[PDB]
Each structure stands twice: as structure tokens, then as C-alpha cells.
Design a protein around this ligand. Structure first.
Ligand SMILES: [K+]
Ligand SMILES: [K+]
Ligand SMILES: [K+]
Ligand SMILES: [K+]
Ligand SMILES: [K+]
Ligand SMILES: [K+]
Ligand SMILES: [Mg+2]
Ligand SMILES: [Mg+2]
Ligand SMILES: [Mg+2]
Ligand SMILES: [Mg+2]
Ligand SMILES: [Mg+2]
Ligand SMILES: [Mg+2]
Ligand SMILES: [Mg+2]
Ligand SMILES: [Mg+2]
Ligand SMILES: [Mg+2]
Lengths: 116, 59, 60, 131
RNA sequence: AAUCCUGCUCAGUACGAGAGGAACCGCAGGUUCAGACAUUUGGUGUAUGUGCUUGGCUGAGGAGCCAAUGGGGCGAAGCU
RNA sequence: UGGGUCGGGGUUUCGUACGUAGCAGAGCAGCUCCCUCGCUGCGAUCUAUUGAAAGUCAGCCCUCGACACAAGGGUUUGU
RNA sequence: AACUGCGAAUGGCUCAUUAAAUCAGUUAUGGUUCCUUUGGUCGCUCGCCACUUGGAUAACUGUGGUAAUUCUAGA
């Protein structure tokens, strides 16, 4: 029930098994047995050794579209306000565009007297 | 509802600014009084009169 | 271990403090941007699948 | 308190180990081990955390033709650590100390065995890492 | 047929002007020796077990063999 | 019922078998009504089949599968 | 405040290196690059948004981590 370690081969080293290797540069390694240890010492790469966990996941041995947008209240207008504004669609919107044109048309007639 | 989490929804601090991002939010077609439909944020400070503040709309 | 929970639809993010490993271990061994169901905590976090968006190390 | 448990020695008299401190010495030739009563024909041997008498063979001339107290901090012989782990290092290394236990140098290159640390607090403070 | 030593505590205590400086009980360990043992780590290794490899040989492939254990890596069990 | 002998399973050792396939492969050699970018060979090695193949009690573990064999032999012993 | 653009390659210090090297005078780039400034050029092309298109991100609100930094994450 001690800390569970992992080897050069990626295997799981139970307590009382293998050896631990402390290099001069400060890195510490643990090997499950002398086979994994000798492979590590001879500088063999575990990605090229077939029975190694690193090799197996490297070669993968054995192993949609979404989006949503939600309406929110925006400071100065509750969700009710925006819905009512965007529900002016059934010609209420068209009613508002056309009164602005005539509300600027008579101003244009005043502007004609102001321009000229 | 999770207590204190799925309630008292916080509003987006401030609405759209580009003249097209307001049209998509409010289904503006074309020249339907685009200026007025922009959200006008009200400001309420105790040591001052109440007043609402509108932003400059781009494009 | 603290959990930062945020619901984009309603904002109102809030911090959850847990000292139980089992409620947390549903999250353990998962990467970011993976959606996990938080049915581990009590009877109130039910029908809730949640996405891991980030975190911080013991050292920050 | 707590005394040091027995460990595999692996460094007999006549072993030349590296000097891991900045004293200017490069190697240390073990001439004897402290606390060794011994036995006919048996070489006094030392492990990590053991205080030894050594003479530096190569290094700086003012350190050479003298006998220095030294403490082994790294060993290449595997040794068991009461919890099942057999630990060994890349080299045999030691540091030069006085009879009181204070390291003559100021810094240690490389790790220091845990047994040598808690047995010698002066060496432990100067240790960059502990294995 | 067991042996001796060290560290902690007693204790900067007794004692002493001071410098210095113990002991009994207790605890944790070591030395020498003794009797075993192989779970672990190490050694051995002709299981002639399994890969690699040189020269030659069976027409080639495959499968093998010879070179007084061809050489070498890893290695069960057993011994240690 | 027994213990054997095979087989099987387990364990374990080594490290991925032969064959087949690949538009993998340094390149090289032939065929161009052909092909409009190809096909036919040689080629160490690579990939997949394939943690495969092989061994494993002879002093490893469990079998209840198969086969035969096991109330047989000889020499002695008395208050 | 922040995004953006520009500057930060100037100035200042020192003289360690360096002996056809540096540097000085002379000459070439018909053997090259060049922010900026100034002046040219900007309908020279036949070919359901143009009355103006798309998405994010800052600053900002809110939840934190870290012993610590002009560190930063999620929303
Ligand atoms: K002695
Ligand atoms: K062999
Ligand atoms: K071995
Ligand atoms: K063995
Ligand atoms: K094959
Ligand atoms: K394979
Ligand atoms: Mg503009
Ligand atoms: Mg002798
Ligand atoms: Mg006697
Ligand atoms: Mg051969
Ligand atoms: Mg062959
Ligand atoms: Mg012959
Ligand atoms: Mg011969
Ligand atoms: Mg071997
Ligand atoms: Mg079998």
C-alpha cells in the first residue's frame, strides 16, 4: 500500500520489487527487473521494444458537431424587452420604418429652407 | 436549480455595438430606425441626477 | 481541493470546496475539454454533465 | 532518536571515490573507516553516511599529501532501505569534513543519500537534492 | 554460545571557581560470532530456454547442424 | 479407487514465428499500340496478421479429457 | 484603463578583443537592401451586402490558484 511506481517499461512496480537508480544529474529511475534495467542502461529506446507500454500505445496495439446560443438580458433591457422589440416583426417594424421617413421628410422640407 | 448558482441570472454587461450585431440580435431588416433600437444603458448614481447613456454604433 | 463551477447560460460562477476523494475521482484521469457528469456530489448535482475547462496546480 | 540501519557497504579500503564538494579535490582514496573493529583479513568497508579517513590523490596540492576525514554521500553498491527499495547511484562520491562533522567545502554536486543526510545535518543543508 | 560498541534520554544535570563533565533505569541501533533461509536484490546458468550474430555445411526458402559450451543479450528452476 | 503417460489450462522466459499481403522501402533493371502517370522484376529493412512463435518439471501449479496399467513378484521372521 | 500605430536598433558608457584586421584618404555597387521625408502612382485590368460583410479579443463585471513575480485560468 506504498506509493505505486512505474518502470522503464511502463509496468507497475509493487513494493519490494526491482531497484531504484539515482543518477548524478539528479534524476531518479525505478526498474521492475534487471531486464528493464539493462535495457535502460544500454540506452535502448522503449518505443522500439515491442513488449513495452510506450511501444504499445505508440503503435496503438489493442486500443460530432455542437453549438448553442442562448438569449440573455443585457444591462438596460430584460429578456422581455428584447423579445418584444424583436417581436415587432409582423409589420409593426415596417410601421416604425415608414413613420421615420416621413418624420425626416418634413424635416427635409425644413432643411431645404435651411440648406437654401 | 442549484442554490445560488442556477438563479439570479446576471445580464450581459452591455449590448451590441456594430450596426450588424444589433440587427442580428433584434431582427432588423434595413433602415428600420436602427439607431433607436440600440440598447440604452441607464446610469443611476446617488450624488447625481438619473440619466441614460447610449453608445456610439460603428459601421 | 476547490472546484470552480460556472454556468454560461446564467453566469453566477461560484466556488465549491470538497475534501472527499470519491466525488472528485470521477473527474480524475480526465483531460481538458471533456464532458463529465457530476452525479457524484450528493443528490443535488444530478442530471448534470460538466466540462473540464481548466485548473491550477498545488503551486498555482 | 533513531540510529542508522545496516546497509550494504561496497567501498572497501583502497577505493578511490569522487569528491563532490568544491574544496578543489577531485578524488578521495579511502584509507580506513571509522568505528570498524574488524576481523582477520577483512577489509574495513564503508557505505553511504559512513565517516572515513581519506587522502586525495588528484586535486589541489595543499590538500594532497594529508589525511582528511570524509563522509560517503553516494555509493554504487545497491542497498536496501527497510521499505523494500534497492537503491544505488551512478557513482561513489564523498565529501571532505572535519572530525566535528562540518563540511570543509560549501556546495555539493549531485544528490546525497538520505541516510547520509539525517546522519549529517551539515551535509544535508548543502545537498542540492536528496535520494 | 553468544560478544562488544555507539547514539538518544537521564543531562550542560551530579561534581567543579571555572574549564569541563558522568552514572543507574529506559529507548533505538550497530560490531564480532553463531544457526538458518531465498520473499526480495545480487551472482551462477549447457533448462543448451528464447532472440541476435561470424565462418562453414545440408542445391535455395523454411528448418537446422558443426566450430572440444562458436560468440554474445536476456533468462525459469535450483544453488548461493 | 490409485498412481502414471500424453493432452489441456495456469505460471513464467524470451521477444513479435513461417507464410501471405502492402501505392512501406535507399534505389536499380526491363515494357511503353499499352500507360497520360503506369506496370513487371531485384532489393537489406519496415508494417499487419502477431505481447506473436517457441519452451516451461525433468524436483513448477490445477486437471478429471484420452490411453494403458494396477490383489503382482522374491527372501525371511515365533513368546 | 485597454486594444491599435509608432519608438524602444538613437543616445550614454567602456576600450577587452582586434596588427591590411580596425581606421584614414580614394573609388565602385553597370554586384544590393532601405522605416521615414519629398515628389510621382492609386476608374490604365472589360471580370439578393456595396447605402458598408464576417468572427474573436481587450479594457470591464464575476470566481479563484500560488510563499512569491510586471504569473495568470475558467466564465
Ligand atoms: K580495526
Ligand atoms: K544462449
Ligand atoms: K539472474
Ligand atoms: K536465480
Ligand atoms: K511475420
Ligand atoms: K507483432
Ligand atoms: Mg467608424
Ligand atoms: Mg592477512
Ligand atoms: Mg566457548
Ligand atoms: Mg552462419
Ligand atoms: Mg535460411
Ligand atoms: Mg562434420
Ligand atoms: Mg575440431
Ligand atoms: Mg546474465
Ligand atoms: Mg503442461
Amino acid at each position: 500500500m506504498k506509493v505505486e511506481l512505474c518502470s522503464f517499461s511502463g509496468y507497475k512496480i509493487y513494493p519490494g520489487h526491482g531497484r531504484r537508480y539515482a543518477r548524478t544529474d539528479g534524476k531518479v529511475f525505478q526498474f521492475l527487473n534487471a531486464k528493464c534495467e539493462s535495457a535502460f542502461l544500454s540506452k535502448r529506446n522503449p518505443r522500439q521494444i515491442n513488449w513495452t507500454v510506450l511501444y504499445r500505445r505508440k503503435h496503438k496495439k489493442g486500443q460530432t458537431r455542437r453549438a448553442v446560443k442562448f438569449q440573455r438580458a443585457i444591462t438596460g433591457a430584460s429578456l422581455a424587452d428584447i423579445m418584444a422589440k424583436r417581436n415587432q416583426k409582423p409589420e409593426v417594424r415596417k410601421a416604425q420604418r415608414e413613420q421615420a421617413i416621413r418624420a425626416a421628410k418634413e424635416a427635409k422640407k425644413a432643411k431645404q429652407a435651411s440648406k437654401k | 436549480d442549484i442554490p445560488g448558482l442556477t438563479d439570479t441570472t446576471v445580464p450581459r454587461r452591455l449590448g451590441p455595438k456594430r450596426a450588424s450585431r444589433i440587427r442580428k440580435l433584434f431582427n432588423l431588416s434595413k433602415e428600420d430606425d436602427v439607431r433607436q433600437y440600440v440598447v440604452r444603458k441607464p446610469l443611476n448614481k446617488e450624488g447625481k441626477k438619473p440619466r441614460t447613456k447610449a453608445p456610439k454604433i460603428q459601421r | 481541493m476547490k472546484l470552480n463551477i460556472s454556468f454560461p447560460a446564467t453566469g453566477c460562477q461560484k466556488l465549491i470546496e470538497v475534501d472527499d476523494e470519491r466525488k472528485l475521482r470521477t473527474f480524475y484521469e480526465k483531460r481538458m475539454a471533456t464532458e463529465v457528469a457530476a452525479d457524484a456530489l450528493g443528490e443535488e448535482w444530478k442530471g448534470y454533465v460538466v466540462r473540464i475547462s481548466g485548473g491550477n496546480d498545488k503551486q498555482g | 532518536s533513531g540510529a542508522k540501519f545496516r546497509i550494504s557497504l561496497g567501498l572497501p579500503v583502497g577505493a578511490v571515490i569522487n569528491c563532490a564538494d568544491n574544496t578543489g579535490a577531485k578524488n578521495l582514496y579511502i584509507i580506513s573507516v571509522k568505528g570498524i573493529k574488524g576481523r582477520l583479513n577483512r577489509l574495513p568497508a564503508a557505505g553511504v553516511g559512513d565517516m572515513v579517513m581519506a587522502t586525495v590523490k588528484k586535486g589541489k596540492p595543499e590538500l594532497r599529501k594529508k589525511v582528511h576525514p570524509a563522509v560517503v554521500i553516494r555509493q554504487r553498491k545497491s542497498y536496501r532501505r527497510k521499505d523494500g527499495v534497492f537503491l544505488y547511484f551512478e557513482d561513489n562520491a564523498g565529501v571532505i569534513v572535519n572530525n566535528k562533522g562540518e563540511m570543509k567545502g560549501s556546495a555539493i554536486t549531485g544528490p546525497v543519500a538520505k541516510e547520509c543526510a539525517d546522519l549529517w545535518p551539515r551535509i544535508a543543508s548543502n545537498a542540492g537534492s536528496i535520494a
